[PDB]
Amino acid sequence: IFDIYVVTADYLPLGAEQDAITLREGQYVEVLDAAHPLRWLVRTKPTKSSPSRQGWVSPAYLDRRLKL
């Protein structure tokens, strides 16, 4: 249903960004809703006991990826 994108160019916020979320080159996260072409709403998937976080990211560094 959703689309899990992967960071293949790294994403480290330089300074203090509001409504932003940190990401590591090689992470997976499906998109929730598409607001503006600049940045879409996404929420990482929780695993084991890690809480799920939601933050806006730039799709200019996210590539289409499908899960098994």
Domain boundaries, the chain: 1-68
The pair of structure tokens assigned to 59 is 């799709």
Q: Kindly report the CATH class assigned to 1-68.
A: mainly beta
- DSSP-derived letter for residue 62 is E
The DSSP element (H or E) to which 6 belongs, if any, is strand 4-7
In Å, how far from its chain's centre is CA 15? 18
The pair of structure tokens assigned to 43 is 């929420």
What value, to the nearest 5°, has the Cα angle with vertex 36 and ends 34 and 38?
115
How many beta carbons lie within 10 A of that of residue 5, not counting itself?
21
Residues 6 or more apart whose Cβ sits within 8 Å of residue 52: 43, 44, 45, 46
What value, to the nearest 5°, has the Cα angle with vertex 61 and ends 60 and 62?
100
3-state secondary structure 21-54: CCECCCCEEEEEEEEECCEEEEEECCCCCCCCCE
Experimental approach was: NMR
- DSSP-derived letter for residue 57 is E
